[PDB]
Amino acid sequence: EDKRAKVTSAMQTMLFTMLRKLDNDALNNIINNARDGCVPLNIIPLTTAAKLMVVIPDYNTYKNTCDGTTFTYASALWEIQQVVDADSKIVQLSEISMDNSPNLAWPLIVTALRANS
Amino acid sequence: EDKRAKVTSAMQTMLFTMLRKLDNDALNNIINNARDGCVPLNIIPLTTAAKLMVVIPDYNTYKNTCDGTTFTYASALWEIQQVVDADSKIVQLSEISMDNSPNLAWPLIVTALRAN
Amino acid sequence: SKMSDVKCTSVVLLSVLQQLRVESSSKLWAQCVQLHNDILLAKDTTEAFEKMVSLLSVLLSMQGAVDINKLCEEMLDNRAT
Amino acid sequence: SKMSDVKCTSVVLLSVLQQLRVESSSKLWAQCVQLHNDILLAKDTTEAFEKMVSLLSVLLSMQGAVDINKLCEEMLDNR
């Protein structure tokens, strides 16, 4: 399983070059978010009020994407329904503050519903 | 009416856009030849002196690709070895001339070997 | 146009997912196939890109199936190969 | 460059061949797979384009697998 992996490496490199060439704002967001550790747990849906789960790795990333109950991702707005920490405990939106950020068990998992696009 | 047949058509149209956008001399020739009915019967070989089989549909197409014993195709040179006519009977190269061409059973098939 | 580039990219992406042995998951693969076909059959770029967001999200949701940092490191080190 | 484009087209081309049920032919498919892998692993544009000529010829050698004029017809009409 050596040549196969070189072929696989080559296919993925060509894949992302096409993605880079596409220069789409929504595609760039999910690719760039994943590089920062903000990755989806399920397929990003397209129906209004459809469930999305994403890993959010740190507070700097959280502040860049979430404002109040609104999550911005893939050029769409998502209303956050649940936040859990690495212990699967519910984090109330009030505790996710700049002042309280070191007391949380990062990374967090956000469960949001699709709403504006 | 099948979604699958529609997908295949959609996939193939995009394929030629990539092929057409490449604007490759070697690729352009084999695609344009096929448009004129000059189509390969086997995989075009990559080694020196490996056999190539191609359909030649008419005399105007023959003259554009064949000079003496040289068949020009895929941006490479090929030495013609044999010509069979539409009835599988061998046709000697001296017979494939402008004056003798209607008397031949088109299409003819050239089996050539890569000179490069 | 750019319509073509998104459909072309989706065939590669499904093929990338092919190599990653996704077909074992007969629902994910069926879901991947449905998304890929919808992109090829799409009539405006909005559908191609929206469906592509979802289809690409499949690769991104696969922990360690790709190492995006590892891959992006390669592009910058290649710098036009 | 042009080379990235040629590798991408080969993945599309092999996939197109798969949709054409070429897989039932083990020996043709192996040739198609080996060429596709060589194109993705290619060192320079000459080898990539030479191998792409070979791989594409698989598609052109298949009578009716493509009706190049009918395909080229929806190309020109749709543009």
Numbering used by the authors:
A (entry chain D): 77 to 193
B (entry chain B): 77 to 192
C (entry chain C): 1 to 81
D (entry chain A): 1 to 79
Task: Share the article's original sentences.
Replication of the ∼30 kb-long coronavirus genome is mediated by a complex of non-structural proteins (NSP), in which NSP7 and NSP8 play a critical role in regulating the RNA-dependent RNA polymerase (RdRP) activity of NSP12. The central unit of the replication machinery is NSP12, which is responsible for the RNA-dependent RNA polymerase (RdRP) activity. In addition, NSP7 and NSP8, with molecular weights of ∼9 and ∼22 kDa, respectively, serve to promote the replication processivity of NSP12 (5,6). We report the crystal structure of the complex between NSP7 and NSP8 of SARS-CoV-2, revealing a 2:2 heterotetrameric form.
Next, we crystalized the NSP7–NSP8 complex and solved the crystal structure at 2.7 Å resolution. The crystal structure of the NSP7-NSP8 complex belongs to the space group P21, with each asymmetric unit containing two NSP7 and NSP8 molecules. Despite the fact that full-length NSP7 and NSP8 proteins were prepared for crystallization, we were only able to trace the electron density for the C-terminal domain of NSP8 spanning from residues E77 to S193, with the N-terminal portion most likely proteolytically cleaved during crystallization. On the other hand, we were able to trace the entire NSP7 molecule except for residues L83-Q84 at its C-terminus. Analysis of the structure of the NSP7–NSP8 complex reveals a 2:2 NSP7–NSP8 tetrameric complex, formed by two closely-packed NSP7–NSP8 dimers. As previously observed for the NSP7–NSP8–NSP12 complex, NSP8 is comprised of an N-terminal domain, albeit with only two α-helices traceable here, followed by a C-terminal domain formed by a four-stranded antiparallel β-sheet packed against three intervening helices. NSP7 is comprised of four α-helices, with the last one moving apart from the first three to cradle the two N-terminal helices of NSP8, resulting in a mixed six-helix bundle. Furthermore, helix α1 of NSP8 and helices α1–α2 of NSP7 pack against the counterparts of the other NSP7–NSP8 complex to form the tetrameric structure. Close inspection of the two interfaces revealed that both the dimeric and heterotetrameric association between NSP7 and NSP8 is dominated by non-polar contacts, involving all the four helices of NSP7 and helices α1 and α2 of NSP8.
